[PDB]
Design a protein around this ligand. Structure first.
Ligand SMILES: *C(CO)CCC(=O)O
Ligand SMILES: *C(CO)CCC(=O)O
Ligand SMILES: *C(CO)CCC(=O)O
Ligand SMILES: *C(CO)CCC(=O)O
Ligand SMILES: [Zn+2]
Ligand SMILES: [Zn+2]
Ligand SMILES: [Zn+2]
Lengths: 340, 340, 193, 340
């Protein structure tokens, strides 16, 4: 008859015993290199050129396109809940606004600058971060000024991007986040800020590690940034490009970045780990993109996982990988959860 | 009139130029530290104690519970497609089979050992990996022998696990993968193998970094391993426990592991990166758990992402993070995709 | 018989005490003896008592001899009898010894370590953060440091809440992620604002 | 009856035995990476524009504001005791002396330059260090030239600071210690020195790691440097800013610093440890600020600790953390103590 067999074991080696460090709920916290707090969250904002706007984004569950006239009633509760920072994204819908050089990018009458002025007056305690790019302002939809052939023109592009970033800062933005990925843009942006005498008050949060992938979905709807002819795989790092990512991190830091952003996040946790060593002295921010965010909601709906649970697992994964800041659409939720 | 502003730029710094390394499709490959190949895939197999079995797992799309009599027709096409390895999971459904010491675990008449003998004869070229645990064979459902209170009994547990692993090897398994997570089990398993004169032919692939989370869903259905009273957070590493994970990796390696497994995968990519340094001389395997696998399918169904695309992004993320082996339910698909 | 500690009997006794505390229901034991090799014996005792998997071992790996243990001598009534405690307690300048003790205790089974004093030994916390990078590090704001802040605050040399925050956040900066302090009640209030 | 229990112990492991290295008083010295000597001390001097001055500073016990006419009788005993270096701080009390550009900073008739000339003639063997800043010479009280809004103007500020440092060197100072903390001031000061052909005889001791805190008390009295509107938290490193401190250390070194100062000291011992690695090839100096100094006296008075004892513990803590130089108000005392 088959009976349970027990092998002859040796005395337990102390070096084998790790269980004593995580047998209690409190220990789970002690074991964390970093704990999740409210001031670590950065809520994205999609400002429309229509003051009374407040449309719901398709691919972006619970996220809408707001106009200045609705901001106040939208931010009030969040700020009271502990929100400390926001990242502005402009969405000009007015016809004839876009062009080949993203002129509307720093339009003082545009959504971005209008939102900055609005927030600075009604919420002088909120930290204002502005994404810096021309994708949402170009006729083509790309992140920069294209040559005649279609490929980006670094020189003119960065020249333009630097102006935009400086103008946002001039408008009152505390921080600029260039999501273009164009070679050397950080240096020119830093120089522009220095020349505008704003380098000492403007934090430069560079999207140092921005990979091309299948998770930018929803954002394409909310921001309306559909590339025109060709792939964005010209500037956006290849998913397997770890070496390039490491070099971009070092480059951006050396070019003046005060902090860096890794995007996507969950699917690029190893990259956050790399940035934590290379950019050990700088704050690292994780960007939970629309695609990852929508992916969690989808799986939760199909009962594959619990939203709050998986939301916590993923976010605390960012902190584990080395991030100390998080740009997420789940901010409103966390502002509640972190209370319990 | 608001007009496009262009800042005065300096000459481009060579150190800024990285674009020259990934402007072509072929370059995307050259930029990869490791390329995805067929022999890197490990398909999981859920063997039932019913020879004619072939039930579809709920929470596990396209995955079923097979009986020995259906294996052959199921493996034939996969093997012809390039499959080189499998990881066996036993699913005894016969009543009165489970007990307090997982006696049925190494039952020569059980699904696991029956599957090994079957595969070794019909597919002598397939690499046979066997998960090693007692969760699916205990009355309680836990991964080991519990004390009277309910908490695991390391001594008896590891003593039992070592016997099971050795018996699988004796049956003919090429590799054993202890997924228990009980402190010091690797040492006892290695010693048992050495004493059984099988240490030189048995690869020990330890689940060194196994985290507790919300992604083990589907498996609970396929394997029928529902914990009885309490949480598995007693042995399974806490999601934020990076320090513990690093110590477990070092421990298992020092205890005789020939390779290590990181599970989950995607949500723990930073941990794979850590293992790649600590266990730089050992092969690292990523385990795309049921929850992650189901999460991709769910998101794909909701049109949030494309299955093939995101499947490739996630898998190539494993390789980027340092893994050179992958246990995934998407193996059948990749065996097709890798052809194009 | 001479007066100097007897490691063998001492550690033998300490291990029993720690195990009994655990048997009583304590989640964690913190050996503040500083006697060579006590962590190993305590871990072994716990293993033999089948409590090693539920008992966290928080060792005072870096305990220095100094002029800041004042107040505690009153509260605990632990006045040494003949001689100095400088026999086991690390010398204030002993960085090398502190580093070796940290490594030793970790290798002996410590699940976490305590650095005491704290403020006056911030560099040691920094060392422990590298050596014991995978373990939680705890700072112990001793009675002397605690009383020193109150004294200076009373003399209007500094503001209690302010300096309390500066010192504590100094512990975190130096690498600690846990803090044993008498200012806890206060922080439980302050951290609310 | 409760009786003493003794567990069964194993043979002592040699690796456990460390006691053999510090069982004797002499061993306490052998165990020190660096021993405290007289030539390691740097006594601060507050020179007033009143030659017969000699007022006692409130918040600074045993420290006074001296005029040139009292220096000689004040330094004579200290120098005979072994004093080898001093750090000069100017305290112009004459009305209409301060202005928006700290003009009086390098006034040849000012206290600082007057003190240098005095010391160079009566004590040609003393090493003269001069703090470099404009806080004590500006109408506002800040460490530099402010813009119209109130925030520092780096360009003009550093431009001014470089002139001041060079003029001190021209006057005869052996070393300059810029305590401004303004970005890039070290580079301009080094360049000015090079252009003045004094770079080979002037040691640049930068306050690389100067944190904002609650320990600058007493100095505000002795130096009379009360900020006007706003916080000094604009240039002074945030108490938790380790990353910034590490970057400032590297920056200053690369900019020409021959040595660096960490201030405060005791409360920033971990920072001294960081500097010891980053600036391993440069001498590191600890600054026992007024607040820490007064804190020891206060605690000693309340019988919380013994002055001599705690003075020794704290100072030898600086050496342990990596410093090999110490700027302290307890110098006079140590010049006595180090004799026994
Ligand atoms: C990145 C654009 O800067 C954000 C994409 C998203 O989906 O959040
Ligand atoms: C882990 C059990 O050993 C596998 C879980 C899964 O869902 O694949
Ligand atoms: C250390 C005794 O274990 C504590 C001393 C104190 O004053 O807190
Ligand atoms: C720093 C000014 O440079 C000295 C402050 C003190 O209190 O010593
Ligand atoms: Zn863009
Ligand atoms: Zn199991
Ligand atoms: Zn100043």
């Amino acid at each position: 008859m088959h009976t349970a067999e027990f092998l002859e074991t040796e005395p337990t080696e102390i070096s084998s015993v790790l269980a004593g460090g995580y047998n209690h709920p409190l220990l789970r916290q002690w074991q964390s290199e970093r704990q999740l707090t409210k001031n670590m969250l950065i809520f994205p904002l999609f400002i429309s050129d229509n003051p009374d706007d407040f449309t719901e984004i398709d691919s972006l569950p619970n996220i809408n396109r707001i106009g200045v006239n609705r901001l106040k009633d939208y931010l009030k509760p969040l700020v009271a809940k502990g929100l400390r920072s926001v990242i502005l994204f402009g969405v000009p819908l007015i016809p004839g606004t876009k062009d080949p050089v993203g002129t509307a990018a720093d339009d003082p009458a545009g959504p971005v600058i209008q939102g900055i002025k609005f927030i600075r007056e009604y919420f002088p305690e909120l930290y204002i971060i502005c994404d810096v790019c021309l994708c949402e302002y170009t006729s083509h939809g790309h992140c920069g000024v294209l040559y005649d052939d279609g490929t980006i023109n670094r020189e003119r592009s960065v020249s333009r991007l630097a102006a935009v970033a400086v103008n946002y800062a001039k408008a009152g933005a505390h921080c600029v986040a260039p999501s273009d990925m164009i070679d050397g843009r950080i240096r020119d942006i830093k120089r522009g800020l220095i020349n505008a005498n704003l380098a000492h008050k403007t934090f430069v949060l560079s999207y140092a590690a921005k990979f091309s992938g299948n998770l930018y979905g929803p954002f394409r709807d909310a921001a309306c940034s559909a590339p025109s002819n060709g792939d964005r795989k010209c500037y956006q790092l290849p998913p397997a490009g770890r070496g390039l990512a490491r070099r971009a991190l070092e480059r951006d830091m050396s070019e003046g970045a005060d902090g860096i952003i890794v995007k996507p996040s969950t699917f690029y946790l190893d990259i956050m780990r790399d940035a934590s060593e290379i950019c050990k002295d700088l704050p690292i921010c994780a960007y939970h993109v629309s695609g990852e965010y929508a992916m969690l909601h989808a799986a939760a709906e199909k009962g594959v996982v619990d939203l709050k649970t998986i939301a916590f697992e993923s976010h605390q994964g960012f902190l584990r990988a080395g991030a100390r800041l998080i740009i997420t659409y789940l901010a409103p939720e966390f502002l509640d959860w972190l209370d319990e």
